[PDB]
Amino acid sequence: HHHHFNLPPGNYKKPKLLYCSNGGHFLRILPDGTVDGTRDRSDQHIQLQLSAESVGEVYIKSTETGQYLAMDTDGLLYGSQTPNEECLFLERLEENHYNTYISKKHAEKNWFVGLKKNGSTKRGPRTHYGQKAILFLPLPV
């Protein structure tokens, strides 16, 4: 492991909104495969079904479109029509409270799912432990 194994509480039974502490955006996977954040709680593309692969590993799937959150080779989040290596994230507790999502594929590089204050996703290399951008709270839909 390149990362700790503090796991967040909760389960994957229900879809979640992934609310980002940073700008208060919900992670959104748009139908065209774009990923960003929106503050609009009624948005139909922020309802995400997480599911476990191995313990601490998740897929993050748009319930609306079926797209999997994925991070590509250059660290960009995208919506994938099919689950692939890029779609696995290490879901961890952070600051004893939040959820973070580390690209499994790029775990050694500490590439996280992150939203900027302006609602744009962070590119993997731009994310780091310590950032607000990487901190998510899974909220009930």
Binding site residue list: 22
Residue 57, both tokens? 């590993």
78: number of Cβ within 10 Å: 19
Residues in the annotated binding site for heparin: 22
Distance between CA atoms of residues 40 and 28, nearest Å: 10
3-state percent helix, strand, coil for the chain, nearest multiple of 5 = 5, 40, 55
